[PDB]
Amino acid sequence: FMVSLPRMVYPQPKVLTPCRKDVLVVTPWLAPIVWEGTFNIDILNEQFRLQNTTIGLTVFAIKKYVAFLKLFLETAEKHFMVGHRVHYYVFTDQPAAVPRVTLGTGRQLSVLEVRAYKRWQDVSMRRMEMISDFCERRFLSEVDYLVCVDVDMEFRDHVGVEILTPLFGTLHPGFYGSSREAFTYERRPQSQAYIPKDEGDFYYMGAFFGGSVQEVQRLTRACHQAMMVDQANGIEAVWHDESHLNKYLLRHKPTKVLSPEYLWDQQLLGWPAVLRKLRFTAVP
């Protein structure tokens, strides 16, 4: 049950003026594409706080990548869901190497040790398997939404409840202006991740997806199962779990799509006019 919003004073939305005219802000299946200027964060914060929303953030930091945790977590504290309840789940092979990061009130961190796996096949499948096969009951009990991101990143600007929805993917920064035939989908019909040249909405990046716990578990389960089939058939998708994520999101449309504000590499791609903010960026 959702209680009434309080009285709020904010600028009136005007029907005969778009928020953005330079970009697509809704997909053909009526999912918002989230760009700066499309949302009033005050309204959204109210809506999500009134539900006492808890967001889980999963991040894998394996081998040398543990070195990225400090900046990842410190910047998440500055920019990720501030004001809301947040539970970080750090999956790592080196629990002792996790930095001691000071957290704001209402935010917690759990260190989850993984796992075994001395063959690259299981490593490739590790993340999808971990989210769907091992942490299933815990996530359902502890958080409302799950967000799955890469560690070799930093937050530079607001990443907040505007992204929350049953299921979201993020436009890959390298390909948002590309035609579908150019997308690096898996193109071999022998792979479960196969997408023909005449199919595809967007190319989504494996580095930032999420949704409700239930929808994320469905996605990660399906991707893990598809990857197991490929392994049995002696094939590895061109971009690993990202290829499978793309197949899943073609066949199960996301209910929001994040713009490349949410996943950017400034060293590689600069700062285009279409990006008013660079929110979450690759570490050079």
Side-chain angles (χ1 to χ4, degrees), residues 109-123:
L109 188 144
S110 297
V111 174
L112 301 323
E113 193 172 1
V114 302
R115 245 323 174 96
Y117 304 144
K118 297 219 83 175
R119 45 199 290 265
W120 75 265
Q121 290 101 134
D122 294 338
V123 161

Side-chain angles (χ1 to χ4, degrees), residues 184-186 203 236-244:
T184 60
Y185 292 149
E186 177 56 61
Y203 193 76
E236 176 71 9
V238 62
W239 289 106
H240 317 291
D241 74 12
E242 175 171 281
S243 294
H244 290 94

Side-chain angles (χ1 to χ4, degrees), residues 29 167 204 215 219 222 247-255:
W29 56 92
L167 178 65
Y204 303 100
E215 290 303 309
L219 178 151
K247 181 59 171 286
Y248 188 88
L249 292 175
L250 174 61
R251 302 306 191 98
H252 306 81
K253 302 303 188 199
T255 51

Side-chain angles (χ1 to χ4, degrees), residues 49 51-58 84-91 106-112 134-147 211-214 217:
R49 273 307 297 147
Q51 300 305 256
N52 198 207
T53 303
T54 305
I55 306 88
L57 182 63
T58 70
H84 291 93
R85 297 185 59 169
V86 168
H87 198 147
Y88 302 102
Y89 298 98
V90 174
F91 293 87
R107 306 172 71 99
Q108 61 186 298
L109 188 144
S110 297
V111 174
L112 301 323
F134 299 132
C135 302
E136 198 163 9
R137 295 179 206 261
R138 187 214 268 272
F139 291 154
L140 285 164
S141 68
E142 294 190 329
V143 307
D144 298 308
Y145 294 94
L146 275 172
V147 175
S212 67
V213 176
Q214 178 172 221
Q217 287 169 346

Side-chain angles (χ1 to χ4, degrees), residues 224 258 270:
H224 174 41
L258 307 188

